Design a protein around this ligand. Structure first.
Ligand SMILES: CCCCCCCC(=O)O
Length: 178
């Protein structure tokens, strides 16, 4: 009866595959118990996601909102401060909508500069603490350990990987959606 809104990028929308092939669709099929609305768009930055949020909240009135954004910010001329501030507004909107925000940790490519990487990654733990919300692990950490689940670009998970990502997310979300 309740709805879980997913606000993410290609990792949740699916890269070079249809939405129906993406793990959130498989998760929804696994759950008439809880409705999963996948509001993810490939290439979206935290800012682009924030821009769509207001309409989505008033439209779907979700109980929980999974935030999976930031991974594109670095390649789009953004500084950790900008990303942090953008995600901060996202969490604010969610709470202000009487919904529980579920933040996912994001980690940039190993080759993006320690200076930025450690600063970027630190944004999530900080925000999770600041708002006192669940901080889910970056699901891609488990996917990297299986080349057969990665597309050529070595960045996006493939079709074969979605079913596993779906079960993994179900387990992570289970205690959070009661
Ligand atoms: C190395 C992890 C960061 C990549 C996030 C993918 C972003 C997108 O395509 O929409």
């Amino acid at each position: 009866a309740d709805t879980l809104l997913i606000l993410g990028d290609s990792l949740s929308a699916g890269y070079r595959m249809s939405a129906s092939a993406a793990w959130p669709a498989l998760l929804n099929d696994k759950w008439s118990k809880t409705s999963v609305v996948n509001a993810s768009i490939s290439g979206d930055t935290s800012q682009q996601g924030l821009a769509r949020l207001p309409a989505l909240l008033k439209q779907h009135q979700p109980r929980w909102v999974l935030v999976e954004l930031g991974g594109n910010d670095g390649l789009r001329g953004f500084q950790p401060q900008q990303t942090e501030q953008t995600l901060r507004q996202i969490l604010q909107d969610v709470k202000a909508a009487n919904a529980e925000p579920l933040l996912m940790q994001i980690r940039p490519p190993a080759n993006y500069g320690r200076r930025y990487n450690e600063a970027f990654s630190a944004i999530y733990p900080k925000l999770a603490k600041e708002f006192d919300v669940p901080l889910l692990p970056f699901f891609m950490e488990e996917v990297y350990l299986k080349p057969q689940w990665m597309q050529d670009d070595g960045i996006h998970p493939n079709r074969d990987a979605q079913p596993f990502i779906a079960d993994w997310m179900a387990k992570q979300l289970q205690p959070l959606v009661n």
